[PDB]
Amino acid sequence: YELTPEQRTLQTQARELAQSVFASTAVQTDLTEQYPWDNVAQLRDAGFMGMMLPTSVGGRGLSTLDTVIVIEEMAKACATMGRITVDSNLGAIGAITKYGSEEQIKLAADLVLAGDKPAICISEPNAGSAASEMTTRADKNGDHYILNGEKYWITGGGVSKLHLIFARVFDDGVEQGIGAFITVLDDHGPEGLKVGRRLYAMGVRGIPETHLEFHDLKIHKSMMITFPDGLKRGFAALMSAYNAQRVGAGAVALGIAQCAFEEGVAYLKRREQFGRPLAEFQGLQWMVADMSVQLEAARLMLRSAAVSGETFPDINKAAQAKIFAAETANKVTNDALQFFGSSGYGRHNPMERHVRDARMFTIAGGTAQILRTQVASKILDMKLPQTRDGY
Ligand SMILES: Cc1cc2nc3c(=O)[nH]c(=O)nc-3n(C[C@H](O)[C@H](O)[C@H](O)COP(=O)(O)OP(=O)(O)OC[C@H]3O[C@@H](n4cnc5c(N)ncnc54)[C@H](O)[C@@H]3O)c2cc1C
Ligand SMILES: CC(C)(COP(=O)(O)OP(=O)(O)OC[C@H]1O[C@@H](n2cnc3c(N)ncnc32)[C@H](O)[C@@H]1OP(=O)(O)O)[C@@H](O)C(=O)NCCC(=O)NCCS
């Protein structure tokens, strides 16, 4: 239940980069809401991008746990850098690594290792929790697929090059299921791929969340992730790669909470009222005790989930960890802010940002409610349909 000597080294390397470079840019990144290109370049040069890619394509061949360790250190410095580390190591790049062809893996690897944070494109304005109800379609046309539809809250929209787009595949009018399509966005850009309006967010403002439109987007069949056993199971396998994403997302939430925790504790020791430091008040001591307990548990849950499953973490262990970590983060950041008092409410301190940044993680990548349903389906060992006629 402890890190290996190699993992401490990886942790130290991650912490050094985050504290000496990223930490001093967190406040401004939140102010400008601008994608930190400079920081991403340093993140790449330190080998913290595409870590789970095989060594045969330039990757380090690391584990999910390795990334989770790195991700948390980045998040403790900057929530934006935390999420970037996630998307550039887990999720879309994970599904491509596992299910993609040699050509598709090489294209994805070259981009990520060059410093590109991939963008996954699943959610639609009328299809969030019910992702299987997405209206983005891909009609087959010869050896190509014509994509028409819209996505939103696309993390990295406008700055991401690599795109993994999920769409309902139709063959001569007949539905085939949902498949994933790879496309790359550049200055010249692919015809039909349009970056929609930006959705300005409560926190983690350093990464643009945008709408995304597809107007007769022509994708060759060599850029569709294919399966020998049909797309019907294909849509069930791509989201299994998202089980690793959730653990990473949980690590970001944990990182934010841990930072706020450390800052709150440090403040209690130096801030004095009634002739003494705040740390000498029992009620505040127990609050500190409560936070440390939940943080320790959260870190255990995340790390435990990371080493579970086969290629990706177990879907339910990951769901349990994500629920715990995200909800833990919301309480810790809020209570840590309370330690600062009035100054905690001031934007000249980072405490109010911590609450704003942490708030998204009970929502994005599957809400805490949808994850509870998932966990319940495991314990009860039954399907839990949400439709009116699912029984
Ligand atoms: C910061 C951020 C970044 C994001 N980045 C991306 C990205 O990169 N790619 C991407 O594809 N998507 C992204 N999303 C979207 C997100 O992954 C989905 O939208 C998420 O599943 C939430 O969907 P929704 O907002 O449509 O929730 P809705 O489906 O509108 O749910 C609304 C509320 O109803 C509850 N609810 C819904 N269905 C049920 C049910 N059956 N039972 C009980 N309760 C229910 C939910 O818990 C939620 O609280 C991002 C979102 C955020 C906030
Ligand atoms: C899965 C979800 C869409 C509900 O779907 P549903 O209508 O209950 O359909 P079911 O879960 O019964 O079936 C879907 C299949 O995909 C599989 N699946 C779904 N999510 C999965 C995940 N995260 N990991 C692995 N497998 C998954 C299920 O095992 C199931 O396979 P089966 O056919 O062998 O049973 C919803 O609970 C969910 O998790 N979505 C959250 C939104 C989201 O993920 N958005 C990401 C964008 S950031």
From Swiss-Prot:
Tell me what reaction this enzyme catalyses.
3-sulfinopropanoyl-CoA + H2O = propanoyl-CoA + sulfite + H(+)
Record-annotated site: Important for activity? 83
Q: Where does substrate bind?
A: 242-243
Q: Indicate the enzyme's highest-level EC class.
A: hydrolase
Reported EC number(s) for this entry are 3.13.1.4
Query: One matching Pfam family, short form?
Result: Acyl-CoA_dh_M
Which key words are in the record? FAD, Flavoprotein, Hydrolase
Chain positions recorded as FAD binding sites = 120-123, 129, 152-155, 271, 338, 342, 365-369, 386
Annotated InterPro entries: AcdA (IPR050032), Acyl-CoA_Oxase/DH_mid-dom (IPR006091), Acyl-CoA_Oxase/DH_mid-dom_sf (IPR046373), AcylCo_DH-like_C (IPR036250), AcylCo_DH/oxidase_C (IPR009075), AcylCoA_DH/ox_N (IPR013786), AcylCoA_DH/ox_N_sf (IPR037069), AcylCoA_DH/oxidase_NM_dom_sf (IPR009100)
Cofactors needed by this protein, per the record, are: FAD
The record makes one more remark, namely:
Does not catalyze the dehydrogenation of acyl-CoA thioesters. The absence of dehydrogenase activity is most probably caused by the absence of a catalytic glutamate residue in either of the two positions conserved throughout the acyl-CoA dehydrogenase family.
Q: How does it assemble?
A: Homotetramer.
Function field: Catalyzes the conversion 3-sulfinopropanoyl-CoA (3SP-CoA) to propanoyl-CoA by abstraction of sulfite. Does not show dehydrogenase activity. Involved in the degradation of 3,3'-dithiodipropionate (DTDP), a sulfur-containing precursor substrate for biosynthesis of polythioesters (PTEs).
Q: What is this protein called?
A: 3-sulfinopropanoyl-CoA desulfinase
Q: Which gene encodes it?
A: acd
